[PDB]
Design a protein around this ligand. Structure first.
Ligand SMILES: Nc1ncnc2c1ncn2[C@@H]1O[C@H](COP(=O)(O)OP(=O)(O)OP(=O)(O)O)[C@@H](O)[C@H]1O
Ligand SMILES: [Mg+2]
Length: 275
């Protein structure tokens, strides 16, 4: 149907760490991580993961920083293998990574990169990703040549082009890894509404996020901590079965407009108090 994981565990295997680094602050937290040692010692990166996501549902994945969110995505992509447990999903998947990549060419060439052009499809993706506001600032609009790896664009601009590229792909499952992590916080709110909630309402999709509105709108929710499932279920269930986490995070007035670093800090801290 959509995607199922039953009691899945995945161990550190050689090369997986380098892959994670190739995508591309608590980097000071990571400074005696040795990917070799994790492989020697036999260590789960993800442990006892369960989820059942139906066709057209949206799973929101959140958690503490370094909890295995991207790794779970990689597991779906087949870059990590389940050592225990069952994973079912079929069909093409489309992946939007944390690192926004940009190829030599026009904005438009970037969004349809490697895929056939369809005008209604294109115009539709451009609009829902809120790119119309960006391209209208340029003399050649979406025919603007990105005369770098889009280096002179904003981080949000690069993230929107990269989102639009993944959303434009025709696929059965969309993996969206933290597109909404930048300062232009009102644009991100329109994008989430227009792209992820409306245009994609019937696409099975997984959104890694650190905003509570995304948990609120989600069909299902996975919270990760230290490579384990801190919680899995609906937003209603989260308020009942994790009441301490919930009231803390809904306690804020405008949590979703804090920086990405601050939201991830509060999430991480909250997950530790309440074990
Ligand atoms: N670049 C890196 N260097 C060293 N250790 C890393 C790096 N990226 C991830 N890790 C470690 O590998 C496991 C985590 O990664 P994943 O990359 O799956 O985290 P996330 O859950 O995606 O978190 P975040 O997005 O906040 O980094 C964790 O135990 C984490 O500490
Ligand atoms: Mg990540």
């Amino acid at each position: 149907t959509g995607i199922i994981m039953e009691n899945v565990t995945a161990f550190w295997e050689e090369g997986f760490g380098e892959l994670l680094e190739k995508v591309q602050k608590h980097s000071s937290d990571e400074n005696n991580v040795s990917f070799s040692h994790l492989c020697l010692v036999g260590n789960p990166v993800l442990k006892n993961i369960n989820l059942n996501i139906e066709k057209g549902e949206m799973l929101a994945i959140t958690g503490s920083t370094g909890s295995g969110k991207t790794s779970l995505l990689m597991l779906i992509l087949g870059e990590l293998e389940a050592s225990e447990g069952i994973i079912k999903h079929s069909g093409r998947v489309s992946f939007c990574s944390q690192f926004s990549w940009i190829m030599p060419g026009t904005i438009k060439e970037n969004i349809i990169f490697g895929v056939s052009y369809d005008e209604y499809r294109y115009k539709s993706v451009v609009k829902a990703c809120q790119l119309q506001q960006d391209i209208t600032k340029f003399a050649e609009q979406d025919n603007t040549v990105l005369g770098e790896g889009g280096v002179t664009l904003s981080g949000g601009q690069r993230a929107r082009i990269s989102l639009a590229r993944a959303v434009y792909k025709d696929a059965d499952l969309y993996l969206l890894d933290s597109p909404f992590g930048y300062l232009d916080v009102f644009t991100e709110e329109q994008v989430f509404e227009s792209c992820v909630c409306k245009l994609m309402a019937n696409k099975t999709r997984i959104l890694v996020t650190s905003k509570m509105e995304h948990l609120r709108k989600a069909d299902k929710i996975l919270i990760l901590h230290q490579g384990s499932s801190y919680f899995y279920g609906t937003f209603s269930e989260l308020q009942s079965l994790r009441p301490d986490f919930s009231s803390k995070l809904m306690g804020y007035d405008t949590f979703d407009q804090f920086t990405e670093e601050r939201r991830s800090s509060i999430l991480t801290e909250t997950l530790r108090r309440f074990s």
